[PDB]
Design a protein around this ligand. Structure first.
Ligand SMILES: CC(C)C[C@@H](C(=O)NO)C(=O)Nc1ccc(Cn2cc(CNS(=O)(=O)CC(C)C)nn2)cc1
Ligand SMILES: [Zn+2]
Length: 330
């Protein structure tokens, strides 16, 4: 009913905990005074507390919010203390509301586009389903929303800026190139989402890890990260070059090709992450097709780089390093 601000915590025991309202911005929430209730929703982002179930009516997480001794600001959580603790994270629900804000703003500030749009053309609200399932060690895009488990023994809750950027960006891809979720195109689809994870981190804080999931891997698990973009094969399953691709290799392992490509391109002399992501975003919007092969995708990057005025010999060197062929790209 009215806009309001939320104060509370985020993070986890591995990367550290922080405060919305001190370290990061206050959260944008809503309040209905007729019932003294606040809702983890704003125009752009809604957080659903799945309550460890697999299905929900998708109503926003709602909590009592009342004035206390000293828009209005309220502490988040069902106990009005800023917390929503689960599996070593301070508040996955606060982190998701903030994650959606950052990803929306990255696409707007860097590209002037909506992260998600409806079929009718209008902006589409980012729906973040948190606390999904029991011990669910994954997160995914389902065609209309983003779903995050709370993890288990190997992972903390899967709500971080990078994971949020990854999942939202599956929707961005679906609504642009439409890269299909199998074969080579599916590896490119997964890769673009890993690229967007890096972009979200760089946009927010000016540094990115070149890894996927280090902030959510439990230290006792023995894995520093889920994926490594500098050398995908460090995870024991992903591939570093297109010559190692085979039919049936899962999209989360064939993503190594474009992940490695993105790392290589962003680290060329005179390049950086932003320029590399500008090429990928433009290719996703204007050139890549739903059944793209890795080679056809490299031709789409060359056309995007030409549009942007970037150096095509730097693109070609990067494609060559991941064994993508471009001899037919004319
Ligand atoms: C940061 C991440 C959470 C992002 C997330 C993603 O990309 N979202 O869009 C991702 O990387 N997921 C993912 C990675 C690998 C596989 C391949 N694989 C593993 C297994 C065995 N485990 S399992 O219990 O069967 C399935 C699990 C996953 C429940 N089988 N196939 C499947 C999913
Ligand atoms: Zn994914």
């Amino acid at each position: 009913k009215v806009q309001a601000k939320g104060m509370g915590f985020g993070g986890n025991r591995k990367i550290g905990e922080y405060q919305f309202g001190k370290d990061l911005p206050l959260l944008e929430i809503t309040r209905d005074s007729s019932v003294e209730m606040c809702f983890m929703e704003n125009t752009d982002v809604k957080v659903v507390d799945m309550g460890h179930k697999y299905y929900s009516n998708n109503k926003p997480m709602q909590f009592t919010c009342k004035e206390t001794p000293d828009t209005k600001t309220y502490y988040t959580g069902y106990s009005a203390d800023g917390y929503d603790r689960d599996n070593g994270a301070a508040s996955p629900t606060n982190d998701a509301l903030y994650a959606g804000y950052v990803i929306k703003h990255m696409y707007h500030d860097w590209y002037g586009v909506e992260a998600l749009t409806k079929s009718d053309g209008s902006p589409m609200q980012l729906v973040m389903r948190v606390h999904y399932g029991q011990g669910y060690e994954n997160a995914y895009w389902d065609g209309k929303q983003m779903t995050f488990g709370d993890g288990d023994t190997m992972m903390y809750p899967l709500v971080s800026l990078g994971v949020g950027g990854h999942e939202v960006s599956h929707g961005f891809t679906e609504q642009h190139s439409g890269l299909e979720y199998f074969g080579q195109s599916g590896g490119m689809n997964e890769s673009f989402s890993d690229m967007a994870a890096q972009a979200a981190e760089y946009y927010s804080v000016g540094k990115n890890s070149w890894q996927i999931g280090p902030e959510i891997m439990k230290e006792d698990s023995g894995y520093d990260a889920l994926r490594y973009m500098d050398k995908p094969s460090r995870d024991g399953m992903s591939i570093d070059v297109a010559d190692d691709y085979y039919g049936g290799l899962d999209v989360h392992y064939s993503s190594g090709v474009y992940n490695h490509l993105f790392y290589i391109l962003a680290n060329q002399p005179n390049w950086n992450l932003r320029m590399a992501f500008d090429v990928m975003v433009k290719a996703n919007m204007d050139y890549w097709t739903p059944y793209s092969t890795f080679d056809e995708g490299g031709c789409g990057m060359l056309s995007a780089a030409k549009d942007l005025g970037y150096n095509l010999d730097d693109i070609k060197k990067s494609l060559s390093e991941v064994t993508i062929n471009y001899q037919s790209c004319y």
